[PDB]
């Protein structure tokens, strides 16, 4: 469990993708264990099929969930024995090279969210925020762009943040269940409030692939504003730091 | 205010025209508090009169005549440096304002490290002996990508507190620099990493940096020689490897994709 990380993957109606991803992730260096957050209420977990195809490099724990809740992967699983957690959605295949490098970045910034998907909030009307990415104008000072969030569905973060999450105001948990969304927006609010630094650091992926609701994006902005009310303040901080691996690919420094 | 700013320290020798050209550029960079020109042309008269004639300029430029032409003259503690950050650049290097503005903001977040555009490293093929080089040499670290253990000071941002700390180094270090008239940057990197326990620097990939040199064989060998010399003086190899390369998110546009 030393200098290792635990992979937490929540799954819902993507069992065939789960097994495909698990086949890849199990072979990544520094992986200590895998916890599958089975959100398919009332369905048998592929653990049987999985074992039959063993042996496997690391332990894979299937934890059947009572309800299909987005926040289930944010609980404090006693089985997590590592300081760091790797959280990936069950439709994303991140290369081992990206994970190895990103994990080494997390070790140097264990209190921030190190991930591959950067996003931000903007404001054109005093106190009213909107959620978005690079299609929206930069908020920050001058040139370039900025991000104030790193989505948790493809990141490394401190396992202590799962406990800390549980201790957030009831209105926050209520909001998450209400929308069954915004869990990562919540995690970013929480982290930056705890550190006073940008909630995360963006690590540009070399090989990350997605294998595969109109108001889904609408809830995004809605949540930011709700969280600002609940917390009585916008804590998110902008950053334009983009980290890549020196020399990987070869000669990428020039 | 001197606080959200940095001081440019440029040492010059036999490049007065190159100096003046660079000055015209650097004087207009945002957050520049002042410029200190370390005049290493022993006996020659400075261009200060010419500078003032073409005034007014955005910031004060102080030309400081030097006793002898020593590489370490730019590492002195100049009383006129009022900032916490120093921007050190060779008088043959032109760095865009964009790079400077971004690099400075990175320095602000890592004030105890050398933020620069030129990454280099040491390698060891025979136990105890080190060699100097760049990306043309194999990687020392485990095995993926490359590594850098130094960020040359000739194009970087670093705490002014280090120029004072450099004066307090073992005479041997000062002697070494004076002996070869080289390795000042290698010494600074040794110093800084010994002080922080972290990699001496962070590499920021430049978007627009150009060498205007055009406008010795032992130089290279001296470098490797200095790493081993310094290792003896410090009874050890303090330099730490890093593979962090920082670029500006969204600059160029969509460079995150
Ligand atoms: C592109 C983007 O903005 N990414 C975010 C978006 O992903 P996105 O909109 O792509 O959401 P997905 O459908 O892929 O689901 C994300 C995760 O939630 C699980 N799931 C999904 C639906 C469901 O009813 N039950 C369930 O458990 C999935 O199995 C997966 O592990 O929303 C998720 C929740 O904020 C975040 O993790 C992603 O970082
Ligand atoms: C790519 C590389 O390895 N870069 C290093 C190399 O640059 P490099 O070999 O290019 O050295 P330069 O000739 O450009 O000189 C660097 C600076 O020193 C001054 N100078 C030079 C010669 C002299 O007799 N007197 C004098 O004061 C120049 O005016 C200039 O400001 O060595 C310099 C000194 O160790 C370092 O700053 C650089 O980080
Ligand atoms: Mn998805
Ligand atoms: Mn040069």
From Swiss-Prot, chain A:
Gene Ontology biological process terms in this record: N-acetylglucosamine metabolic process; UDP-N-acetylgalactosamine metabolic process
An example molecular function term from Gene Ontology annotations: glucuronyl-galactosyl-proteoglycan 4-alpha-N-acetylglucosaminyltransferase activity
Binding residues annotated for Mn(2+), in chain numbering: 91
Reactions it catalyzes: 3-O-(beta-D-GlcA-(1->3)-beta-D-Gal-(1->3)-beta-D-Gal-(1->4)-beta-D-Xyl)-L-seryl-[protein] + UDP-N-acetyl-alpha-D-glucosamine = 3-O-(alpha-D-GlcNAc-(1->4)-beta-D-GlcA-(1->3)-beta-D-Gal-(1->3)-beta-D-Gal-(1->4)-beta-D-Xyl)-L-seryl-[protein] + UDP + H(+)
Active site (record annotation): 184
UniProt keyword list: Disulfide bond, Endoplasmic reticulum, Glycoprotein, Glycosyltransferase, Manganese, Membrane, Metal-binding, Signal-anchor, Transferase, Transmembrane, Transmembrane helix
Enzyme class: transferase
Cofactor(s) needed: Mn(2+)
EC assignment: 2.4.1.223
Annotated binding of UDP-N-acetyl-alpha-D-glucosamine, by residue: 10, 14, 39, 68, 73, 89-91, 183-184, 220
Protein name: Exostosin-like 2
UniProt organism field: Mus musculus
Protein's gene: Extl2
Coverage span on the entire protein: 63 to 327 of 330
